[PDB]
Amino acid sequence: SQPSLKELLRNVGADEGDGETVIDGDVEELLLDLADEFVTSVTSFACRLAKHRKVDNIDMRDVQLHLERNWNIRVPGYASDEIRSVRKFQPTAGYNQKVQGVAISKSVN
Amino acid sequence: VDKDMLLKVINIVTEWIFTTKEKAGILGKMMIFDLELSKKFNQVIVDIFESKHTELTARMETAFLFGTRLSDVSIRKKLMSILSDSLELDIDKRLFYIIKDQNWEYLSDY
Amino acid sequence: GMNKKFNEIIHLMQQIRRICFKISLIRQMQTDKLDSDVSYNSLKRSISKILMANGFESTAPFCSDVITQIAENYFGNLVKTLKNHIESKSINKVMGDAKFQKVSNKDILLLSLLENGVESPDALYEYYNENIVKQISKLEGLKSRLSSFLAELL
Amino acid sequence: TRESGKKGMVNSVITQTRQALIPKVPVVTRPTNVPGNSVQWAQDVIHGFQALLASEIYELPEMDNLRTRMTGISREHGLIGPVDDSVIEIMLIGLEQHLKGIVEAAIDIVKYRRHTLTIEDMYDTLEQYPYLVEPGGTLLRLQSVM
Amino acid sequence: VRLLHLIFATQNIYSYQDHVPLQLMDFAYRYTTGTLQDATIYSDHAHASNAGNAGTNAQLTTEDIRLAIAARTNYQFKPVPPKELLLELAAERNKKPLPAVIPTWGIRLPPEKYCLTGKDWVL
Amino acid sequence: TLEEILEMMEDEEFTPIIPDAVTDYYLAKNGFETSDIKIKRILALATQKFISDIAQDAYEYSRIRSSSSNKVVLTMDDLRSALGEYGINVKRPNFY
Amino acid sequence: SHTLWSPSDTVKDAAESLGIFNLNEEAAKNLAMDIEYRIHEILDQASKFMRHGKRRTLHTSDIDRALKVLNLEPLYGYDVSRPLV
Amino acid sequence: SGIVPTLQNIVATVTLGCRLDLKTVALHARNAEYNPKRFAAVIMRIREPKTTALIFASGKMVVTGAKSEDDSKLASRKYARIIQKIGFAAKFTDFKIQNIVGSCDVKFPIRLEGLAFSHGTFSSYEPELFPGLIYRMVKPKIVLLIFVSGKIVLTGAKQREEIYQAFEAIYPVLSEFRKM
Amino acid sequence: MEIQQMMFVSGETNDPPVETTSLIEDIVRSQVVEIVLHSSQTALSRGTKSIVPEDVIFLIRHDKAKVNRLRTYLSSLKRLKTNDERTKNMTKEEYVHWSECRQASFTFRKAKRFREWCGLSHLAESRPSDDVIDILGFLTFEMVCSITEEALIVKMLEERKHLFDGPDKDVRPITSGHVLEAWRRLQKRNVEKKAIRNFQGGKLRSRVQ
């Protein structure tokens, strides 16, 4: 085996240099609760999105996508999943036919 | 390859010490050549410690500890005499030195 | 109304130089208590007087309504910021018993500007000089085009 | 007719709540073979709901707590297999990024250019910028601590 | 659309202004575009994208749509009445006593420095 | 600096395009009264600048559309792009 | 089909305007289901704002606010004047 | 003791005031690159003074390659023959110099870092934008490229004397930052 | 990312392990693929498959333009002057190493592998030119220089007889957390003038640099 608190205090001592020392009982509790809610929601949506993969297995790389998608948190790290699609705006003939039809209805007839 | 090409490479490496990381990888792979020419090779690693400290000891301290192991009496007497003067003459500070400092590289049989 | 007057001078120069641009193309190719609706439409007037870029109300009307509503939202967001800071009910704000306002009445204003859009004050000085320089820049660009076309037609 | 030609899609409230409150259990069938090579358990869900989660303690959770809580949620949603020790770290990363954003916002509120911050400033900035936090749970709790 | 008037008829609201149907139809178009867009992303996700690893072929079953909608309602769309949360939260508020005092026939204001003193704002 | 900026708003040399009456109405709507004139002109000015910024976004995004090196119209594609590049949300109109 | 808002053309118009081809029918049925429910949802909220203005002829401000309260994006560009065709 | 700039290339433009049937003169000249779909002008040439010449139908021509104002002028006269003997009003006239580039070697490495960040008013080093370190003189209008080896390139002079002038003024500066 | 490690040295600092360099490699690759996605989409919306420079300079559309223009033509300021003036020095080829990083960018020649390592399956019917390859070299170099600046800034903001085996020539400045904080900082969201829709709900947007 291995030979066996300074995370928030480091999260805040590195933000500013003019004091700005927060208070517990009022402010700190808020932040801890927010963090808890964040983790619960994220892992829930991740596990659902893993079950979506039609394989009843572990959850990896779904968190990175869920973060990049719903929140605006990108992580430049481990997974590399992007859209790969321009998401073109014209299937086969018939839609642009409707486009030009309503276009001529607009201009003349 | 033949020993003459290795001796010419060792002579070319001897002129280099008189990048630094590039000299480390050449001296590091020459420690793998210990498995004669190593007696010429570990001759160089003695005088490197005799010239200079402020030099990068990355190639030095892992080859110094394979220098006492190689079973040739004239350089193991030479190398271990350098290390045994750098410490204090007390037996306290030589006892803390072997466990608290000077990490032992070799997991191996030695 | 010097800001109104200079935007109007931009408007006049735009009218005349774009007219000249178009005829030059033609010759080349020849070869108080107030209410809601008045406020809305006044803002639309002012908006379409901003638009030196395209042409003054030279776009579809949906876009004019869009722009009106957007700028309304922005102005409201300004004031919702300043009044929020002013109520504050927090020790950082709030007149101290010994009349010690940790942040006086002006930092409020500077700060509410900062929260919404504008970063610093002098960016406004900057945008102002930028405007009046845009006037002479586009002026001289299309004036050089005018002189070169007066040379070309000969 | 009445649509949702299924075993059902209830639209009530209380059963949504209850069914969204009790822990579930991913118990499996075995008609011919249901692979996975690791039997499903709900000891994990009880262990997950029993953790000393955040907001009792004063610090953001270190890996182990978060891992114990996740296994619970994954089994409780209907997955199987153990979380693989890289998920926790990326999650911590996103978390601390989130909170640095929030507190940067509050600092941008209080001082323009020796101060000390309160609850009201954070309520102010969560009135201005509510797109940061997802509604539910905490904002209601925030308007019951003032 | 006449069917939108038909749907208005369900709630006894026959007093529209004729901009509402345009607006709500525009809305539903926007909404479903976003929905079946991110559902297509998830259909790609099951198809194991990156800078060239495989193709992109569309099926778009109902599960993907369910995923793409649950994410939206994660931060939108006023949910079921969260009664229990409110009950416990309000019991936490409904815990500490009233002041039990007598201002003696007037109004009792907050102390100045919490009152506003709505003077002409000035620098 | 800053103090010049409220040295200047008072006199007629700098009077925002947004008339005083309209801004007074919009101050009042969102709930603010004060017998100063500077501040109202100032919020006028900032709004003028913000709309100018979307103006230039529209101008350039129109200038890209064809022939880089029947007059100009700021249509729904130009607007869709600039409003999008902001935080203003998606404009997906339709027909039928 | 299931309900109003025939997904054979409406949802088809939507998806084929996006640039897909493969939307199974039952999926578009369920999609019609969802968007119709969202309609009833927003409609009741704007009714709640209607009968505080103590009027009947629901205007656009009602639904605009009813969006603003659902944490949902607004919708600009719909003026009462200049009527419809 | 002398270190002086050499002329590496003079780009001159002179006009044979008369219309020129480029197809024709390309034909006769035969070894003149004349080609469709691109650049409408005939590219002539000569073994010595080894210069290239872009002849334009607008009666104007741009001769390049000469290492001296006199050679250019000479090559400028040669060309108004090959397109004169072919019955033409090849009137050599208004000869002008468009640019003169030089080069020099001081033979001592230079401490460019020190030059640049004490002469940042004129000197320039962005690694992604370009290799090496530059210098822009205001009087005379010359752009000098200075390299560590001590080799410098003087560009943009419209007249010979400005190259010597530019180097005569920057030499003491380079001696100050001579790396030893 | 040997070029990135050289580019990281060119900015200011030395000695990244393989971790930070592979991470930065992922960063730059992601930024660049996003740029080309947007530019290709915009061109095809204009109705052309060929990737061009006019879109891409306007894709940056910011003070990001003056420097990029200079790089093409060849093919605040007091601080960047003062730091360089402090650098002025020589020996063990002091100024010599500075030049290496400048002319070892991907655009120098190795355009092929730089094109291939990034995404290239996009736009299979066309293929861009080498001018944009040089452009991307400029953008990647500037991105690496900026990231390094912010990492150093946060690092600084955080604030017996020798046993002769410690060489006293080894330092450990830069790692994952520093770069992560810096890349959070640079994603300053928008100037915040692009997120002024202050009171609402919901959000999503991509970003560069």
Nearest residue to F24 via CA among C68, C45, E120, C34 = C34
Which chain E residue's Cα is nearest to F31?
A: E118
List of chain I residues whose C-beta atoms are within 8 Å of the C-beta of residue C74: 196
Query: Please, are residues H94 and H110 in contact by the beta-carbon 8 Å criterion?
Result: no
Domains of chain H in sequence order: 1-11+98-180 (3.30.310.10), 12-97 (3.30.310.10)
Interface membership of I27 toward A (CB under 8 Å): yes
Interface membership of D110 toward C (CB under 8 Å): yes
On the 0-12 / 13-18 / 19+ scale of CB atoms within 10 A, C134 is middle
List of chain D residues whose C-beta atoms are within 8 Å of the C-beta of residue C91: 118
- Per the CB < 8 Å rule, is D3 touching G71? no
Rounded-to-5 percentages of helix, strand, coil across chain H: 25, 35, 45
CB-CB: which of E74, E75, E89 is closest to D141? Answer: E89
The DSSP element (H or E) to which C148 belongs, if any, is helix C122-152
C-alpha span between H172 and E114 (Å, rounded): 73
Determination method here?
cryo-EM
F-interface mutation test, from G11, G12, G17, G84, most F Cβ less than 10 A away: G17
Amino acid at I196: I
Which stretches does DSSP call E strand in chain G? none
- Report which DSSP code applies to A7: T
- Per the CB < 8 Å rule, is E122 touching F34? yes
Query: Please, are residues A82 and E51 in contact by the beta-carbon 8 Å criterion?
Result: yes
Which chain F residue's Cα is nearest to G10?
A: F96
- Per the CB < 8 Å rule, is F92 touching E29? yes
C-alpha span between I204 and A65 (Å, rounded): 13
List of chain A residues whose C-beta atoms are within 8 Å of the C-beta of residue G17: 89, 95
List of chain C residues whose C-beta atoms are within 8 Å of the C-beta of residue G77: 62-63, 65-66, 69
Kindly report the nearest CA distance between residue E93 and chain D, in angstroms.
6
C-alpha span between F82 and C22 (Å, rounded): 27
Nearest residue to I138 via CA among I174, I113, I114, I112 = I114
* Domain extents in chain G: 9-70
Interface membership of I143 toward H (CB under 8 Å): no
Query: Please, are residues A30 and D124 in contact by the beta-carbon 8 Å criterion?
Result: no
C-alpha span between E113 and C100 (Å, rounded): 11
List of chain D residues whose C-beta atoms are within 8 Å of the C-beta of residue E81: 13
* Domain extents in chain F: 1-96
Kindly report the nearest CA distance between residue I63 and chain D, in angstroms.
25
| Long-range interactions of H38-44: CB distance < 8 A, separation 24+ | H44/H79, H44/H82, H44/H83
Residues in chain B: 110
Count other Cβ atoms within 10 Å, centred on residue C86.
Answer: 16
Angle of CA points G38, G42, G46, to nearest 5° = 170
Q: D30-40 burial by CB neighbour count: b if 16+ within 10 A, else e?
A: eeeeeeeeeeb
Is chain C in touch with chain H: ≥3 Cβ pairs within 8 A?
no
* Domain extents in chain E: 1-123
- Count Cα atoms within 13 angstroms, Cβ side, for I121: 11
List of chain I residues whose C-beta atoms are within 8 Å of the C-beta of residue D100: 181, 184
3-state secondary structure of D116: coil
Which chain G residue's Cα is nearest to F83?
A: G76
List of chain B residues whose C-beta atoms are within 8 Å of the C-beta of residue I163: 86-87, 97, 101-102
Superfamily of domain G9-70: Histone, subunit A (1.10.20.10)
Is chain F in touch with chain H: ≥3 Cβ pairs within 8 A?
no
CB-CB: which of A48, A70, A82 is closest to E50? Answer: A82
- The number of angstroms, rounded, from the C-alpha of I66 to the middle of its chain's C-alpha atoms is 16
Interface membership of G44 toward E (CB under 8 Å): yes
Query: Please, are residues B45 and B60 in contact by the beta-carbon 8 Å criterion?
Result: yes
- Stated in angstroms to one decimal place, the resolution of this structure is 20.0
The three-state (H, E, C) secondary structure of chain I, written as one string: CHHHHHHHHHHCCCCCCHHHHHHHHHHHHHHHHHHHHHHHHHHHHHCCCCCCHHHHHHHHCCCHHHHHHHHHHHCCHHHHHHHHHHHCCCCCCHHHHHHHHHCCCHHHCCHHHHHHHCCCCCCCCCCCCHHHHHHHHHHHHHHHHHHHHHHHHHHHHHCCCCCCCCCCCCCCCCCHHHHHHHHHHHCCCCCCCCCCCCCCCCCCCCCCC
Give chains near G: 3+ CB pairs under 8 A.
Answer: A, C, D, E, F, I
C-alpha span between F23 and F31 (Å, rounded): 12
Token pair, residue F46, equals: 């900032």
According to DSSP, the β-strands at H60-66 and H133-137 are unpaired
- Per the CB < 8 Å rule, is D108 touching C114? yes
List of chain I residues whose C-beta atoms are within 8 Å of the C-beta of residue F85: 194
- Per the CB < 8 Å rule, is I23 touching A77? yes
F-interface mutation test, from C2, C3, C43, most F Cβ less than 10 A away: C3
- Count Cα atoms within 13 angstroms, Cβ side, for C52: 23
Token pair, residue F17, equals: 């395009």
Interface membership of E89 toward D (CB under 8 Å): yes
